[PDB]
């Protein structure tokens with residue numbers, strides 16, 4: 001007959017607590033608007049969003 | 050711009066990264082003035 005798999009009985013979830021936010025909304029909503037000729041790049045890492 | 054480094058041993062390890070948005074063209078090793086070296 002066909003096969004079978006052992007059904008899980010729990011769930012493991014691990015994350016890094018007390019981590020600051022990425023505050024991406026403040027970067028997009030800025031008064032200084034760039035130009036397509038001199039566009040910049042900002043890297044978001046080690047934060048929550 | 051990626052850059053690896055090693056202090057002990059031949060294999061290297063990641064050190065840092067940097068974004069510039071431009072293409073690097075040339076490089077040069079300046080001489081050392083001393084009285085008392087290979088690269």
Ligand SMILES: *[C@@H]1O[C@H](CO)[C@@H](O[C@@H]2O[C@H](CO)[C@@H](O)[C@H](O)[C@H]2NC(C)=O)[C@H](O)[C@H]1NC(C)=O
Pocket residue numbers: 026030031032
């Ligand atoms: C909008 O962009 C400007 C850049 O033009 C940001 O101003 C910089 O703010 C940081 C602090 O977060 C300073 O270290 C820089 O010196 C500032 N650059 C300047 C004054 O040219 C600004 O923070 C951004 N956000 C807002 C809400 O204006």
